């Protein structure tokens, strides 16, 4: 599964650490991928790049995630609830996140030589 | 729904805030969406990092627009032709523009604090 | 077909001219697009950015494909094991080459001042 992480530069670089393995916490505990596998892209945006809702900080950031399809709905609400819940400390709050599954057929994956149904 | 704006920095940048605003009239337009969740990312391109096809010129621009499922493809074809209509005055003629409309459950969205469903 | 490619910027500037034609190969090849069709973005990151597995190295390199519905599996499997294969000469190995395909309906495509079902 690969995600893909986008804030403000000056509010999502100070703690893109910390967040980096929250995230990768909440993959294995909601489903159950082995924390090594952790598949991270961050882009820290300039403030004229980034047009996010007024009602919402300057700490608004949005998670993009693809994987396959065949987990349940149960099991994708239970990783977006521990996302919400684990970015409270880091100054994020449920306001300022947005979360967004994609899910595609294995067979439209490709990793270690092989098609994902492989 | 959020939007994702690819092109050469060299040419949108200086119209971005523009461009911004007429996008957002085009969610609100085709989608009735309100102004106030204008939601939309900036990638602005060097040369060397944006193959696209001879025929085009250094104008060419990319919108990838991700939202949920369950609007009228009437809809979505209203919202293509009013971006066509509306950039057409910045400079992006029909041959420089290029849509792509992604859709998604609901309860597949993570947004303040719940999954989309609720 | 919209192409992106994502790496450390070390090691896909060096290679990215060659890594561009490369894949406009595999999309000719395995599903017939004409090669003056290429639409490719390409993001080259910093270290601090890329957060990759640590059984891969940093010429690690992520590929999304999104296009239309209805190539078969078959297209689509061919395509990437040419991919696989045609990346080695630029030293990336197959551990360290992920591929992911998107699929949307026609109409849900915008381009040359027309919705993709109607041209």
Redesign the interface.
Known sequence: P?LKI?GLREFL?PI?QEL?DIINSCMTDALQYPP??????????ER????????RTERYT??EL?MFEGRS?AA??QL??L??ERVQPLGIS??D????????PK???????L?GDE
Chains 1, 2 share one sequence.
């Open positions: 690969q986008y670089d893109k980096s090594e596998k952790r598949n991270q892209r961050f882009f820290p945006l004229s790049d980034f047009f996010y809702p007024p009602d949005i998670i693809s709905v994708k609400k977006i609830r996302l919400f449920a306001q996140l947005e979360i967004t599954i994609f899910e595609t067979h439209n994956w490709g990793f270690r030589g098609p």
